[PDB]
Amino acid sequence: TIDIKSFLKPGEKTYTQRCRLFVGNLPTDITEEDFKRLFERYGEPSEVFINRDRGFGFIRLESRTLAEIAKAELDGTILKSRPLRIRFATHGAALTVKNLSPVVSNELLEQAFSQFGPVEKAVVVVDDRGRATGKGFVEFAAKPPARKALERCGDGAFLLTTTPRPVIVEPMEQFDDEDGLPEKLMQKTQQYHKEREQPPRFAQPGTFEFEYASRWKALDEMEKQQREQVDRNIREAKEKLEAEMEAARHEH
Amino acid sequence: TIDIKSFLKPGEKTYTQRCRLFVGNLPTDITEEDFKRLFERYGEPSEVFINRDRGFGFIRLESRTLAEIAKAELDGTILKSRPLRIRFATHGAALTVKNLSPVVSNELLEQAFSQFGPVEKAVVVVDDRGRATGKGFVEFAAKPPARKALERCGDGAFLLTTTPRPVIVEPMEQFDDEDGLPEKLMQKTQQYHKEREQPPRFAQPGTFEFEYASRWKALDEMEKQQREQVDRNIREAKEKLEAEMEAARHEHQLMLM
């Protein structure tokens, strides 16, 4: 048994879109007041929406952790004989930013993206040593500023620094690193059954499997070599352009 | 104010490396009992390590959520006039797995990797549609089983399915999507200052800035074209290998009498 208050993370803004909890399998008689009542224990709600005919509703909570608690506690709970379906409503307004200068901080990224509309969170992604990857993410309070940000940065050249290095803005690709692929959600097809016939094993040298797997390892090596060759060519091209343009900087 | 118990997520293993906290700036007089005492409120710890001379230690809590709570509550707390530094311990035994068949589940990936040693968690990564990406991760309880898995899968061909599609095992690249790049950790060099001179803005068509930024957009387009050319080379090579291996399957089978 334990008590806490304010499960907010340092630097986490309140009532973010990450705290948007979709609610499914609600009774048809559901009122907006009864819907709010269900989540009473998770503090003051926000962005309450209910589709009475469809039996689903959008709610939002103070922090990501309260939304995870509400989901953990309430998912499967029985309301008017039906088990509730509780999940998160996927961040439409999320963006992945690339081609960031190493001097761009979380603060500068937020400052820049705020030109498009209100920013919930902006993060410059760092590696294990704590050095900038050149990638970051920007989450807006609403979808119209994120679309504005996406469209304007795609057509025009958005610069964060003095050097005209344009920022690459793409929608954030949503991936689940928690639930993944459970056996219960996986269909037991005749292909599943044929592929799982042979257990996990090391391919034995000399065998047909080993020969095929050696060829696949060699193909993976060629892919790695070619991809590294592309990374190298991109660097040679950037070094030969910035050596021409800094000279051409004296044309007009 | 709110009450809960067992902040464990569905299918989350207890006391994993994801529950491990690094604790720094501890008093030199710190005893192992006093260290445990500090975290009393977060339930029973499994794993307690303290380096008294260096003023740091490790503690492992039951769930990821309890470790987040302990960190949120205790980071910066004053002990014998010094503020405590509490951070998640970087996972020392996490691996990224690639070239997974679409029929590989979290359970099969765990089952497979457990051959190398105890697995804390194994996840088959899925997209927004809930379809397999072909990528996954495996976190071991300790570094020796992770190294064994890395070495053995690199030299040999580890297969998870009937079809001899080998699994690609690499150390998991550690990236922080929470703290990122704070201004306080960023050095205020001449270059930082020179780069921050001009504010964020749209490059105006016709200008020198726009011409340079258009050339950078064209370089990003060359990267896309080259990477698509690699994808094409790989499809052609895979088609070639498959034909050759159907012929080699017949050869292998016909050798046996």
- Asked which of B136, B154, B182 is the last residue of a domain, the reply is B182
**Can you tell me the distance from the alpha carbon of B216 to that of A140, in angstroms, rounded to the nearest whole number?**
26
Two tokens, residue B114: 């457990």
**Can you tell me the distance from the alpha carbon of A88 to that of A32, in angstroms, rounded to the nearest whole number?**
19
CB distance A97 to A91 below 8 Å: no
Two tokens, residue B229: 């050319």
What type of residue sits at position A167? V
CB distance A28 to A55 below 8 Å: yes
Q: Which of residues 135-164 of B touch A (CB under 8 A)?
A: 136-137, 152, 156-164
- Greatest Cα pair distance, chain B, in angstroms, is 81
> What is the number of alpha carbons within 13 Å of residue B49 lying toward its C-beta?
12
What type of residue sits at position A69? I
CB distance A71 to A89 below 8 Å: no
Report how far apart, in Å, the C-alpha atoms of B149 and of each of A156, A159, B35, B134, B172 are: 47, 44, 34, 18, 13
CB distance A97 to A169 below 8 Å: yes
User: Is residue A183 packed enough to be buried (19+ CB in 10 Å), middle (13-18) or exposed (0-12)?
Assistant: exposed
A32 Cα to chain B: minimum distance (Å): 24
**Can you tell me the distance from the alpha carbon of B235 to that of B226, in angstroms, rounded to the nearest whole number?**
14
For residue A10, the chain B residue with the least C-alpha distance is B72
Report how far apart, in Å, the C-alpha atoms of B117 and of each of B101, B139, B189 are: 22, 11, 47
**Can you tell me the distance from the alpha carbon of A117 to that of A207, in angstroms, rounded to the nearest whole number?**
61
**Can you tell me the distance from the alpha carbon of A46 to that of A19, in angstroms, rounded to the nearest whole number?**
9
Two tokens, residue A214: 């050696």
Residues B107 and B72 in one domain: no
Q: Which helix (H) or strand (E) holds A133?
A: strand A132-140
- Smallest Cα–Cα separation from B160: which of B189, B130, B191, B134? B134
Report how far apart, in Å, the C-alpha atoms of B218 and of each of B214, B215, B221 are: 6, 5, 5
Would you give the DSSP letter of residue A176?
B
What is the C-alpha R_g of chain B?
25
CB distance B167 to B153 below 8 Å: yes
What type of residue sits at position B205? P
Tokens 């009450």: give the residue: B3
CB distance A227 to B227 below 8 Å: yes
**Can you tell me the distance from the alpha carbon of A202 to that of B167, in angstroms, rounded to the nearest whole number?**
10
Report the number of distinct structural domains present in chain A. Answer: 3
Tokens 């009937």: give the residue: B162
**Can you tell me the distance from the alpha carbon of B64 to that of B119, in angstroms, rounded to the nearest whole number?**
16
Residues A23 and A104 in one domain: no
For residue A236, the chain B residue with the least C-alpha distance is B219
Residue among A166, A176, A226 minimizing CB distance to B216: A166
Residues B1 and B89 in one domain: yes
Residues B134 and B149 in one domain: yes
**Can you tell me the distance from the alpha carbon of B101 to that of B99, in angstroms, rounded to the nearest whole number?**
7
Q: Are strands A56-60 and A46-51 parallel, antiparallel or unpaired?
A: antiparallel
Q: What domain range includes position A216?
A: 183-252
Sign of the CA dihedral B62, B65, B69, B71? positive
**Can you tell me the distance from the alpha carbon of B54 to that of B50, in angstroms, rounded to the nearest whole number?**
9
Name the experimental technique. X-ray
- Asked which of B158, B182, B206 is the last residue of a domain, the reply is B182
Q: Write the CATH number for A197.
A: 6.10.250.1170
Q: Write the CATH number for A167.
A: 3.30.70.330
Residues A9 and A36 in one domain: yes
Beta bridge partners of B2: A4
User: Is residue B110 packed enough to be buried (19+ CB in 10 Å), middle (13-18) or exposed (0-12)?
Assistant: middle
Partners of residue B121 in chain A, C-beta under 8 Å = none
Partners of residue A101 in chain B, C-beta under 8 Å = 195
**Can you tell me the distance from the alpha carbon of B61 to that of A19, in angstroms, rounded to the nearest whole number?**
25
- Smallest Cα–Cα separation from B216: which of A106, A225, A134? A134
Q: Which of residues 86-125 of B touch A (CB under 8 A)?
A: 90, 99, 101, 103-108, 111-112, 115, 123-125
Residues A87 and A159 in one domain: no
- Greatest Cα pair distance, chain A, in angstroms, is 76
**Can you tell me the distance from the alpha carbon of A66 to that of A14, in angstroms, rounded to the nearest whole number?**
11
Under 8 Å CB pairs connecting chains A and B tally to: 293
CB distance A119 to A139 below 8 Å: yes
Q: Which of residues 14-53 of A touch B (CB under 8 A)?
A: 41-43
User: Is residue A245 packed enough to be buried (19+ CB in 10 Å), middle (13-18) or exposed (0-12)?
Assistant: middle
- Asked which of A134, A167, A182 is the last residue of a domain, the reply is A182
What is the C-alpha R_g of chain A?
25
To the nearest 10°, report the CA torsion of A38, A42, A44, A50. -40
Residues B85 and B103 in one domain: no
Residue among A115, A124, A186 minimizing CB distance to B105: A186
What angle do helix axes A64-74 and B64-74 make, rounded to 10 degrees? 150
Residues A87 and A158 in one domain: no
Give the burial string for A152-177 (b: 16+ CB within 10 Å, else e).
ebeebbbbbbbbbbbbbbeebeeeee
Q: Which long-range contacts (CB under 8 A, 24 or more apart) does A26-32 make?
A: A26/A50, A26/A55, A26/A56, A26/A57, A26/A79, A26/A82, A26/A84, A27/A55, A27/A79, A27/A80, A27/A82, A28/A52, A28/A53, A28/A55, A29/A80, A30/A55, A30/A57
**Can you tell me the distance from the alpha carbon of A146 to that of A152, in angstroms, rounded to the nearest whole number?**
10
CB distance A214 to B166 below 8 Å: no
Tokens 């492992």: give the residue: B60
Residues contacting residue A228 through CB under 8 Å, at least 6 positions apart: none
Residues B174 and B202 in one domain: no
H runs (alpha helix) in chain A: 32-38, 64-74, 106-113, 143-155, 190-195, 208-248
**Can you tell me the distance from the alpha carbon of A244 to that of B62, in angstroms, rounded to the nearest whole number?**
58
Give the burial string for A98-119 (b: 16+ CB within 10 Å, else e).
ebbbebbbbbbbbbbbbbbbeb
Residues A19 and A64 in one domain: yes
Residues B100 and B164 in one domain: yes
Q: Which of residues 179-238 of A touch B (CB under 8 A)?
A: 179-183, 185-186, 189, 191-192, 194-198, 200-203, 207-217, 219-220, 222-223, 226-227, 230, 233-234, 237-238
User: Is residue A136 packed enough to be buried (19+ CB in 10 Å), middle (13-18) or exposed (0-12)?
Assistant: buried
Residue among B3, B137, B182 minimizing CB distance to A106: B182
Report how far apart, in Å, the C-alpha atoms of A63 and of each of A49, A113, A136, A221 are: 18, 22, 21, 44
Partners of residue B173 in chain A, C-beta under 8 Å = 127-128
Give chain B as a 3 state SS string.
Answer: CEEECCCCCCCCCCCCHHHEEEEECCCCCCCHHHHHHHCHHHCCCEEEEEECCCCEEEEECCCHHHHHHHHHHHCCCEECCEECEEEECCCCCEEEEECCCCCCCHHHHHHHHCCCCCEEEEEEEECCCCCEEEEEEEEECCHHHHHHHHHHHHHCCEECCCCCCECEEEECCCCECCCCCCHHHCCCCHHHHHHCCCCCEEECCCCHHHHHHHHHHHHHHHHHHHHHHHHHHHHHHHHHHHHHHHHHHHHHHHHCC
> Within 10 A of A3 (CB to CB), how many other CB atoms are there?
9
CB distance A69 to A17 below 8 Å: no
**Can you tell me the distance from the alpha carbon of A228 to that of A224, in angstroms, rounded to the nearest whole number?**
6
Residues A149 and A70 in one domain: no
